[PDB]
Amino acid sequence: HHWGYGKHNGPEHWHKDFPIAKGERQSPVDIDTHTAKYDPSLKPLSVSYDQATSLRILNNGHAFNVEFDDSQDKAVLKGGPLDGTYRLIQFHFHWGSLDGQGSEHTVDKKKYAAELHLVHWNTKYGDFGKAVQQPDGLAVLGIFLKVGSAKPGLQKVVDVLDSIKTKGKSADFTNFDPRGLLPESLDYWTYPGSLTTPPLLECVTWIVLKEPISVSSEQVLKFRKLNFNGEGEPEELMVDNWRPAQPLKNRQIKASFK
Ligand SMILES: NS(=O)(=O)c1cc(Cl)c(Cl)c(S(N)(=O)=O)c1
């Protein structure tokens, strides 16, 4: 009875195996744009993906992860609310069964069609495994996806999904440039949170971009053709793998813009 997004193993059930699910700094959260306060103490956000080196893509049973080689000082996120440097390890998405839902964070209660998460770990902790055990161990850059014009830089990801339809399947995914998934503006909201999937560790500094990227209906439709199940099992379409907004618990969401 592994965790998932279904009626009997979904978000409302996670707290049983992962008590922290009802913690003080859980993610995602609704971003109230009027309550978010501009913070002039925020340094410019720095996204350096020029040397990013992807290794492969994997269907983990709830979504798919595009993993990167993080053994060297490449693809780093710094600045903004961050102290030190965070290294890119993987990215994945959360999406819905319909265009009207799919994102984890919401803006003034608005739900986007999907959400891209670029996960980075704080280099001062040596590696990802140790980083997740720290309050400031990870920095996740969140980007909203809306349905409209196609995102050229996403097509390579979309075309390889046919090869990792079911749980446990993986495939070589080299030379993918994450820069092609970034919107024009780096304006963002930031707050202290957690992993949005079990183990739900509260080790994340969330940086959510205000500007969404546009992807075509055809692109997101291919996301929905993935399977939650493994090869040779009853087909359960991989859709609605998002966790709903959690209590803000007095935390304050800071904005990098006015
Ligand atoms: N289990 S996972 O690979 O989906 C996953 C792993 C990690 Cl480390 C993080 Cl931060 C996230 S998230 N949704 O960005 O909080 C998801």
Ligand SMILES: [Zn+2]
């Ligand atoms: Zn995520």
